[PDB]
Design a protein around this ligand. Structure first.
Ligand code: 402
Ligand code: 402
Ligand code: SF4
Ligand code: SF4
Ligand code: SF4
Ligand code: SF4
Ligand code: SF4
Ligand code: SF4
Ligand code: SF4
Ligand code: SF4
Ligand code: FES
Ligand code: FES
Ligand SMILES: [Cl-]
Ligand SMILES: [Cl-]
Ligand SMILES: [Cl-]
Ligand SMILES: [Cl-]
Ligand SMILES: [Cl-]
Ligand SMILES: [Mg+2]
Ligand SMILES: [Mg+2]
Ligand SMILES: [Mg+2]
Ligand SMILES: [Mg+2]
Ligand SMILES: [Mg+2]
Lengths: 574, 572
C-alpha cells in the first residue's frame, strides 16, 4: 500500500493511478487542459495540471503516477503562478475575441483564463485569418487563431480512428495541426468524422459552415426550403439550451424550425425507414442468392471513406441503398414535387445532422439526378442551435408541434438509427418479416445494442442461422479486420459506424465538459431517448410506416428493383 | 446504486463492469479471454459468466453494473455454464501437462483445477507436426494448446499495432498465426514476444536455445561463457516463488557456476561498452551538427520496426552494437587475449528477458572473423528451467561474484533494463565527455517511468539539446504518425519495443492476471535496477575499472580504430 499526503490530508491507498485522477476521485481540484480520456500532449505538455511534489518540485499531475511517500500540494503560490504563466503564454497565441466566437458559451480555455485571471503579454490580433483558417474541406474547418497546440484532436483521432489523419506539422519552423502534407483533409485518409472537433477545448476546430447556404435559401423568395433532422438531434440539442441530458425535444425542434422560416418540416427518420425498406429487401435477396456476403451497411459516410481509403475491396459488398439523408433527399426532388406541385429546381433540401461527414456525403458529385442535388445543405446540431439562439427563439419555452407527415412519419425502427446497433436492429425487424412472409411480434435485438466496440449475434431467419456483427467506431473496424476476426466465421450482415456510440456521439454534436462527462455517460443517455421513442411508438417496423407505404405504392413501386433501385440506390464502388 | 452480489448488498456509483467491481471488492469472478481491458469480442469465452436475477446469464467482463442488480456468481446455473465452456476448451487441448513448458504456472490449468473441469473427449493428436511451427528464430506456436482466446491478438495490436498475430481460417478451422501462415520472421512482426506474455497456456513460446546451451556445456572442448541482461536479476526470482522485485544477482552467479558454465560475466559490462561507444558517437554528432536525431539501436524489436516501417531512419541509428552483441564481439577477441582460450572454442551464451534477442544473435552479419558474437540466447524462463532441472537450490544459494574482467558494471549499465535507462546512462557519459568534466549531478529522473512518450531538454556545454524516450512499439507509431517527431529538432531518441522496457520483455516470467492487479510489475522490476545504481560506487559507464583496462589494453579509444572496426554495426 501507499501513503499519499495531498494538501495535508493523508490517503492510504492500493490504487495505481495518476495524481490527477486520484485527486479528482477524492474531491481535490486540479486543473487540466491537454489531458483528455487518459492521454495528454506528450511533447510540449501544457502543464496546467501542475502540482508540487515535495522533494521533487513542480510536476504534471495528469501523467505522474502516485507513489508511496509523496507529499503533494495543489494550490501553493508557486503552483498557481506556473499555471497562470502557461495560460498567459497561450493567450499570446490566441485571438481572444469571445463575442463572435462559436465556443463563447462553453469554452474550456475561457474558463481557465477566468479562473486564473490570466492576460496576454501582447494581444494576439491576427491580420490574415485567410492564412490561419483552412476551410477547404467539405466537412471540417481549422481556425488556428484559436489553436492551443494541446494535441487533443491528434489524440482523439488516433484513439477513435487510428488513422492519425490529424497531425502536428512543421510549417515554416512553427508547429501547427493539420492534415498530412498540409493537404485538404478530404484529399487524405481522413474519415471526416469530426471526433477531433469534439475533443477540441476551443473554437479552433469546427464544422464546415453551411449556415450561409441555409440562410440564403430561406431568404430567397423562390426557394422552398425543406428541413429534416437526424434521429440523434432530438436527443441532444436541448443540452445547448441548459435543459439537461437525455431530454426528448422532438416537438420543440419542429416548432423552432417553423419559427426559423423553413417551408416544410420533415424528418430523416422517414428516410431511415426508406433505407430499411431497400436494405432489408437487399439482405433478403442476398440470403436467397447465398451472398455476396458479408453485406456491410453503407449509411455512415465516415465508414464509406474508411472503406474507400483502406478497404476498397469491400465496396462491392456495401449495401447499395442510399443513406437516410441521401435517400430522403432523392425523394425530396422527385416524389415531393409530385405530391406538392413545387418546381423541383426550387426545392432546397436541408438536413440537421449530428455529423460532419454528412456534409461531404451531401456534396458528393454523383449525389444528384438531372441537375438537382439530393441534399443542398447540411447543418450540424451545433449549427441549428446557433441559428435558434441568433433568432432569439426561446427554445426551452416552446410548445410542441408535429412534422408534416408525408415525409415526416417514422417508425420505431427508424427512430433508433442514431445508436450503435440501431440500423442492425431496424434492418433485422424488416428482413425477418420479409423472408418469413410473417408479422413477427418479437422484434427486440438487445444483443446488438450497447457500447462494446465489436458486437455479434447469431440470428434465425426463415429456419436458417445467420451471423451479424456491429462494428462500433472506426478504430474497431480496423481491429475487426486486422485481427482477422472477420475470418473466424462467415458473417452475413455487418453494421459499421465511424463514431463510437453511433451518431449520438457524432462529430457535429454538442460539446460536453469533461467534468459533466465524469458524471454522465453521454452515449447511453442520448441513445436512451431513441430507444424510448421506439418503445412508445405504435409502429416499430419501417415497412409499417403509413406515409412511406403510400409513397412506394403511388410513386416508387416495389423496393429493391426497378424505379426504386434506379434512383434510391447508389453504386459506391464505381 | 445498490447491488447485491451473492446476498451481500453493495452501495456504489463506480461506473464499472461486474468483473472489475467484484475484483475490487475481493469477490472472485473467473475470467479467461479478458486481459488488458479487452475480451475476445468474437466467440467470447464466457468464463466470466454470472447470474443477474432478471436478465439471465451475462458475461461479467463486459457488462456494466446497475442499481439494484442482484448478481449470483456461484449459482448452480453459473457453474455448469463455466464448467461446460472449460470442458469444451479441453476438447481442443492436448492436456498433457507433464512435459509442458507452462506446467508450473499455467493460467488455464489453474482454471481447470478451480472447476475440476475435464474434456468430454480427450484431444490426443497422434501427429503434432502440423500443429507446431518452430520456423522462427524467436517465437514458436503449438496449436494443440491454443484456446482461441484472442489474448495474443489483442496484445499484439495494443503493444505494437503491427497485428502480425491474427486469427486465420485454415481448412475451415480457426487458428492463430501470421498472414498466409508465414514464418513470423518474414512478416512485420517485431519478435517482441508480447503475445507470449499474454498467452495463458503453452501455445506460444520462445524458440528454445536450451539444446544449444546444453550441447556446448557438454562438449569437452567448448569454453562456455555466460552473461545475463540487466533485467534477469530483477525477475527470475519470481519463478522460484520468491516474490516480486527481488534482487537475486549473486544467487544467479552461483547458480550459473553450478550449471557448469566456464566463465561468469555480465551483459551490464556490455551495457557500459555500448555507452562508451554511443555517448562518444552522440558527442561527435553534436560537434558535427548531425546527423540528428540519433536513435538508439540496442532493442532488436525496434530495429525490426524501423526496418519494416521506417527504413528512412536506419541511417540515423547509432552504430554501437547492443550490449548483447558488443559483449559477444569482445568475448571472442578481447577475452581470448586475456585468457589463452582458442577463440574458436569460446561459446558465448546470454540470458535475456527477450525473444527478439535470439533473432539479433542469429543475424548473419553478427559475427567477426568467422566467430559469432553470440552463440546462444536463453530467456529468463529458460534459465529458470535449466536451474530447476539441475537440482540447484536457487533461493538457498550463497552469493558469489562475477568474473570481473568482463563482469564489472557501473550503475549506468545497471539501469538499462528500464525504459529511459539507456538515455540516462548515455547522458551521464556524454555530458562528462563533452564538458571534459566529472559532473556530480547524474540523475535524469525526467526520462524515467511509464509514460509512453517522454522528453527532456538537456544542457551540454551551455547548449540545449532535445531528447525523447519512446516506451513501447505502439508509442513509436504514435510519435511518428502524430507528427510529434516534427514539433522540434530531436537530437537523441531512445526507442524500446516493450512498454516498461526490457523488464517487461517477451522472455520474462508470466504473471497471473491476479498478481498483476496487486503489483505494478513494470515498476517493481525496474526498481531493482535503480536500487543497484543508487548503491554502486561507480555510476558512469566510463568509470568501470575493468572496462577502462580493456579499452586501454585492447580496443584503444571509443569511436575510433579497433573500436569502430569491431564494436559497431550499421543497418543499411
Ligand atoms: N443518414 C443517416 Fe443516419 C439516419 O437516419 C443519421 O442521420 Fe446518423 C444519425 N442520427 C447521422 O449523421 S447516419 C449513420 N447511421 C445511423 S443514423
Ligand atoms: N543487449 C541489450 Fe539491453 C542491455 O544491457 C538487455 O540485455 Fe535489454 C535488458 N535487460 C534486453 O533484452 S536490450 C534493449 N535496451 C535496454 S537493456
Ligand atoms: S476559443 Fe474560447 S477563449 Fe478563445 S475566443 Fe473563443 S470563447 Fe474566447
Ligand atoms: S475528422 Fe476523424 S479521421 Fe479526420 S482528423 Fe478528425 S478524428 Fe481524424
Ligand atoms: S485544434 Fe483544438 S484540440 Fe487540436 S491542438 Fe488546436 S486547440 Fe488543441
Ligand atoms: S457514425 Fe454517424 S455521426 Fe459518426 S461519421 Fe458515421 S454517420 Fe456521421
Ligand atoms: S498448456 Fe497448461 S493445461 Fe495445457 S498441457 Fe500445458 S500446463 Fe497443462
Ligand atoms: S512477437 Fe510482438 S509483433 Fe510479433 S506477433 Fe507477437 S506481439 Fe505481435
Ligand atoms: S496462442 Fe495463446 S493467447 Fe493466442 S489465442 Fe491461442 S491460447 Fe489465446
Ligand atoms: S524492449 Fe528489451 S525485451 Fe523488449 S524487444 Fe526490445 S530488447 Fe527485447
Ligand atoms: S493537463 Fe497535464 S500536461 Fe496538460
Ligand atoms: S472473460 Fe468474459 S467473455 Fe471471456
Ligand atoms: Cl460521388
Ligand atoms: Cl405533409
Ligand atoms: Cl545481418
Ligand atoms: Cl575474470
Ligand atoms: Cl511512472
Ligand atoms: Mg502522456
Ligand atoms: Mg423563404
Ligand atoms: Mg469486448
Ligand atoms: Mg563444459
Ligand atoms: Mg514491408
Amino acid at each position: 500500500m501507499k501513503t499519499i499526503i495531498i494538501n495535508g490530508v493523508q490517503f492510504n491507498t492500493d490504487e495505481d493511478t495518476t495524481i490527477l485522477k486520484f485527486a479528482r476521485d477524492n474531491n481535490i481540484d486540479i486543473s487540466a487542459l491537454c489531458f483528455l480520456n487518459n492521454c495528454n500532449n506528450d511533447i510540449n505538455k501544457c502543464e496546467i495540471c501542475t502540482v508540487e511534489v515535495e522533494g521533487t518540485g513542480l510536476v504534471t499531475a495528469c501523467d505522474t503516477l502516485i507513489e508511496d511517500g509523496m507529499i503533494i500540494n495543489t494550490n501553493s503560490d508557486a503552483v498557481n503562478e506556473k499555471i497562470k504563466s502557461r495560460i498567459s503564454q497561450l493567450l499570446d497565441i490566441h485571438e481572444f475575441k469571445c463575442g463572435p466566437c462559436n465556443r463563447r458559451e462553453n469554452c474550456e480555455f475561457l474558463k481557465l483564463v477566468i479562473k486564473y485571471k490570466a492576460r496576454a503579454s501582447k494581444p494576439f490580433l491576427p491580420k490574415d485569418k485567410t492564412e490561419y483558417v483552412d476551410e477547404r474541406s467539405k466537412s471540417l474547418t481549422v481556425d488556428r487563431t484559436k489553436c492551443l497546440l494541446c494535441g487533443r484532436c491528434v489524440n482523439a483521432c488516433g484513439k477513435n480512428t487510428e488513422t492519425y489523419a490529424m497531425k502536428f506539422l512543421n510549417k515554416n519552423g512553427k508547429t501547427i495541426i493539420g492534415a498530412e502534407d498540409e493537404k485538404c483533409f478530404d484529399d487524405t485518409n481522413c474519415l471526416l468524422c469530426g471526433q477531433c472537433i469534439i475533443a477540441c477545448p476551443v473554437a479552433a476546430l469546427s464544422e464546415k459552415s453551411h449556415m450561409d447556404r441555409v440562410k440564403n435559401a430561406l431568404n430567397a423568395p423562390e426557394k422552398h426550403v425543406i428541413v429534416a433532422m437526424a434521429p440523434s438531434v432530438r436527443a441532444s440539442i436541448g443540452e445547448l439550451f441548459n435543459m439537461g441530458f437525455g431530454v426528448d425535444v422532438t416537438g420543440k425542434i419542429y416548432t423552432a424550425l417553423r419559427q426559423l422560416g423553413f417551408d416544410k418540416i420533415f424528418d430523416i427518420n422517414f428516410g431511415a425507414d426508406m433505407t430499411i425498406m431497400e436494405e432489408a429487401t437487399e439482405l433478403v435477396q442476398r440470403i436467397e442468392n447465398n451472398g455476396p456476403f458479408p453485406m456491410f451497411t453503407s449509411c455512415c459516410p465516415g465508414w464509406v471513406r474508411q472503406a474507400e481509403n483502406y478497404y476498397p475491396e469491400l465496396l462491392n459488398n456495401l449495401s447499395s441503398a442510399k443513406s437516410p439523408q441521401q435517400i430522403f433527399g432523392t425523394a425530396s426532388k422527385t416524389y415531393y414535387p409530385s405530391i406538392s406541385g413545387l418546381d423541383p429546381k426550387n426545392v432546397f433540401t436541408v438536413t440537421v445532422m449530428p455529423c460532419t461527414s454528412k456534409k461531404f456525403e451531401a456534396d458528393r458529385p454523383q449525389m444528384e439526378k438531372d441537375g438537382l442535388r439530393d441534399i443542398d445543405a447540411v447543418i450540424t446540431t451545433r449549427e441549428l442551435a446557433k441559428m435558434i439562439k441568433d433568432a432569439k427563439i426561446p427554445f426551452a419555452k416552446l410548445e410542441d408541434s408535429e412534422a408534416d407527415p408525408a415525409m415526416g412519419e417514422y417508425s420505431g425502427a427508424g427512430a433508433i438509427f442514431g445508436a450503435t446497433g440501431g440500423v442492425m436492429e431496424a434492418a433485422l425487424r424488416s428482413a425477418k418479416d420479409f423472408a418469413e412472409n410473417a408479422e413477427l411480434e418479437d422484434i427486440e435485438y438487445k444483443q446488438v445494442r450497447g457500447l462494446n466496440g465489436i458486437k455479434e449475434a447469431e440470428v434465425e431467419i426463415n429456419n436458417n442461422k445467420y451471423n451479424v456483427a456491429v462494428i462500433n467506431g472506426a478504430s474497431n473496424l480496423f481491429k475487426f479486420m486486422k485481427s482477422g476476426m472477420i475470418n473466424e466465421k462467415q458473417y452475413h450482415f455487418i453494421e459499421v459506424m465511424a463514431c463510437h456510440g453511433g451518431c449520438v456521439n457524432g462529430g457535429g454534436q454538442p460539446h460536453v465538459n469533461p467534468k459533466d462527462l465524469e458524471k454522465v455517460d453521454i452515449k447511453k443517455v442520448r441513445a436512451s431517448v431513441l430507444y424510448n421513442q421506439d418503445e412508445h411508438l405504435s409502429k416499430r417496423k419501417s415497412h409499417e410506416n403509413t406515409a412511406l407505404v403510400k409513397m412506394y405504392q403511388n410513386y416508387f413501386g416495389k423496393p429493391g428493383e426497378g424505379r426504386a433501385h434506379e434512383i434510391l440506390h447508389f453504386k459506391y464502388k464505381k
